[PDB]
């Protein structure tokens, strides 16, 4: 149930049902770090299929046999569509250039193309992993290209649409809560009123600005290293390959990829990934604040803040009515913490390039893709399983507005500062309301209190 292949170090058993070859088996033997959960992220694998599909078509310009190119293109399409994920067993913790994964991409695409052509698996005929599938490319400029394709597609498909959905649901709730006045909190102390809508509109703005920040990190991610070859000069590739492969990847993906203007900058560093991680890191801070607020605003039922009633998506206890754990807030704030740690990992790698090549590439793109997927998915989950079903506990909020000591300043132009203060002090001492106290002190009538103390008039400048 295995075939025998060879590398210059010896013979290796390759399972008959696997499209990878000797280079990949050897790689598995030498990089056993962390297990299966540490396998190279699927979006990197798919991005490699896109790049190899692109290169094969372009290389027809540079002597690649059209019949061989087309089988390569078809096989690379299968990789890009996620039909061959089981033929990539290598972990992130390999070489820092991601060379093993490039070799394994080349082998899988070679062997599947060979199969399509009716050839023998493991024979390198008629499709050679290096000479055909890796034609005009280098170990050093392929993985970086795969990283950026992967990141851009993830931001485009997962991260940004997730945040947009969250934005829209937060905005919708903002409008729904536009007339519900509650007591502000500063330093967590009671403070002057604001609407739930105003408070939520802050969250909306943060998510809005988060999307702008992420978008602003994308132009440098669209720059591709393909064509720099070994050290940046483009030695051993062809004139035109850099520009054509970028345009081809752009046509296949519909994203505006271009070749990096400076290939030395593109190979020796991944500052673009650091900046993209940076924008996600800010996004995590916004989302930590939005989810934690909502967590606390939904606390109760009676020893908390109790402003919000959160959807209950999973069974509680009938003898515990009103008690609902803010589960999605917890998922979201945990993601937020992860992103911040991922950002430090990304940063340490990005800072440690040496001369012509940064060799921390797999760990950098892992952490960027991890953060982008978590943020996107959590946004969608948080939206659908919490935000959209949020209701205001208007009964409890109205009660707490009436029990507040904050509104007492509304009395000042009518009874003066000292009578207003004495009302607040006495209410504070007796555990009664401003109105009850103000009446008992004979300072005003109930009818006067209602006319003079209007929360709706305490929501803006004059």
């Amino acid at each position: 149930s295995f075939r025998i292949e060879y590398d210059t170090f010896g013979e290796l058993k390759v399972p008959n049902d696997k499209y990878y070859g000797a280079q990949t088996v050897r790689s598995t033997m030498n990089f056993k770090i962390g297990g299966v959960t540490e396998r190279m992220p699927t979006p990197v694998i798919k991005a490699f299929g896109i790049l190899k599909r692109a290169a094969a078509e372009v290389n027809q310009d540079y002597g690649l046999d059209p019949k061989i190119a087309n089988a390569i293109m078809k096989a690379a399409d299968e990789v890009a569509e996620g039909k061959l994920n089981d033929h990539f067993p290598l972990v992130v913790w390999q070489t820092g250039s991601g060379t093993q994964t490039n070799m394994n991409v080349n082998e899988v695409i070679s062997n599947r193309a060979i199969e399509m052509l009716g050839g023998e698996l493991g024979s390198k005929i008629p499709v050679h992993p290096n000479d055909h599938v890796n034609k005009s490319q280098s170990s050093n400029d392929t993985f970086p290209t795969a990283m950026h394709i992967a990141a851009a597609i993830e931001v485009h498909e997962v991260l940004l649409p997730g945040l947009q959905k969250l934005h829209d649901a937060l905005d919708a709730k903002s409008k729904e809560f536009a007339q519900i006045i509650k007591i502000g909190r500063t330093h967590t102390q009671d403070a002057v009123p604001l609407t739930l809508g105003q408070e939520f509109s802050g969250y909306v703005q943060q998510v809005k600005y988060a999307m702008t920040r992420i978008k602003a990190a994308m132009p440098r991610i669209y720059e591709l290293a393909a064509g720099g070859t070994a050290v940046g000069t483009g030695l051993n590739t062809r004139i035109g390959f850099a520009e054509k492969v970028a345009a081809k990847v752009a046509a296949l993906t519909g994203l505006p990829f271009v070749t990096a203007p400076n290939k030395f900058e593109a190979l020796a560093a991944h500052d673009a990934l650091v900046e993209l991680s940076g924008a996600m890191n800010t996004t995590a801070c916004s989302l930590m604040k939005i989810a934690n607020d909502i967590r606390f605003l939904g606390s109760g039922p009676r020893s908390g803040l109790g402003e919000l009633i959160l959807p209950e998506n999973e069974p509680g206890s009938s003898i515990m009515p009103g008690k609902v754990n803010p589960t999605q807030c917890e998922a979201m704030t945990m993601v937020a913490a992860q992103v911040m740690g991922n950002h430090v990992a990304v940063t340490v790698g990005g800072s440690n390039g040496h001369f012509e090549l940064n060799v921390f590439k797999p760990m950098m793109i892992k952490n960027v893709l991890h953060s982008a997927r978590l943020l996107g998915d959590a946004s969608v989950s948080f939206t659908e399983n919490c935000v959209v079903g949020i209701q205001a506990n208007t009964e409890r909020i109205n009660k707490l507005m009436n029990e507040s000591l904050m509104l007492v300043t509304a009395l000042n132009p009518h009874i003066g500062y000292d009578k207003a203060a004495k009302i607040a002090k006495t209410a504070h001492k007796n555990g009664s309301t401003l109105k009850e106290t103000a009446i008992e002190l004979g300072y005003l009538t109930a009818e006067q209190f209602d006319e003079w103390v209007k929360p709706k008039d305490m929501l803006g400048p004059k």
Side-chain angles (χ1 to χ4, degrees), residues 166-186:
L166 173 56
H167 168 277
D168 296 353
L170 282 174
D171 192 39
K173 285 292 162 179
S174 188
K175 294 178 190 174
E176 190 186 343
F177 298 162
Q179 297 190 277
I180 306 174
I181 307 166
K182 55 134 193 196
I183 293 291
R185 291 182 193 88
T186 57

Side-chain angles (χ1 to χ4, degrees), residues 259-273:
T259 197
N262 190 296
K263 291 289 192 304
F264 310 91
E265 182 264 344
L267 288 188
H270 302 293
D271 301 341
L273 288 180

Side-chain angles (χ1 to χ4, degrees), residues 15 46 66 84 91 109 112 122 125 133 136 146 170 179 212 223 227 274 294 302 324 356 359 373 411:
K46 296 181 170 172
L84 300 168
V91 296
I109 288 174
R112 177 69 177 116
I125 294 169
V133 188
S136 307
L170 282 174
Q179 297 190 277
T212 293
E223 301 185 10
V274 179
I294 282 175
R302 299 183 170 187
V324 188
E356 278 57 78
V359 290
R373 170 82 178 263
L411 294 178

Side-chain angles (χ1 to χ4, degrees), residues 92-129:
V92 170
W93 321 102
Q94 49 176 263
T95 195
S97 53
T99 311
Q100 284 82 51
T101 283
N102 187 53
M103 296 185 305
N104 156 322
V105 166
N106 286 330
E107 294 190 322
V108 164
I109 288 174
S110 170
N111 277 322
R112 177 69 177 116
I114 282 170
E115 190 183 43
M116 289 168 169
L117 294 183
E120 183 178 358
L121 291 160
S123 71
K124 311 182 187 74
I125 294 169
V127 188
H128 195 280

